[PDB]
Amino acid sequence: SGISLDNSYKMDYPEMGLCIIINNKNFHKSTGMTSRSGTDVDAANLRETFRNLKYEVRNKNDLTREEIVELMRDVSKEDHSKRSSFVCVLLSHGEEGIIFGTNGPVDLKKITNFFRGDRCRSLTGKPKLFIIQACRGTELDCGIETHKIPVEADFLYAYSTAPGYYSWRNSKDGSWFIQSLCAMLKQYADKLEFMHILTRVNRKVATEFESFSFDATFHAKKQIPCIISMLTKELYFYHLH
């Protein structure tokens, strides 16, 4: 056959892959972590959005740290040979490097290690996407007026916010980042490479949202999401028939 290029991940396997959504709304009282009003709106929006991208969506609600680890271990041990990609969405409290189960923290490194190129062989060479709506610290952005492959290769972290910063969630509309991510996937998943979709998400969050608070400390604050790419190819959710 004619000249061939391989600048993009093969996304025409029989299945697009799993979309695991971990939706942590209610936390154990002893942790002192507040309920995350609005996160169900996020979880429902993600379920529909990735359903239309033909992902096999699994929604899990209010998981302990132990349940999060066991779920991700179990998922990593499935046979993904017929799947193009893997997506995990984490909706919870967090700090830098950490996502919270309902009763305590989980290292993000422990979650993502289960999917290393050497530990999940049926996902080696395939994009592994981790989409994280959670705080990364307590900073606030005041804004300004205007033969082998590496085991860490082929991961993408779509973080809702910059390192060190809070992330914003609206109790009625859902989180700024997940709202914007789903809108941009709905509009551009049949049109744009994934990094370009995520860049539109960056602009939408950065330009269309500002916090409103009776507390001057938390009022009029802004947010920029953070794309972390170890991908080795372009990622398009569509393929050519």
Partner: peptide
């Protein structure tokens, strides 16, 4: 608006 709330923070996570």
């Amino acid at each position: 608006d709330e923070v996570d």
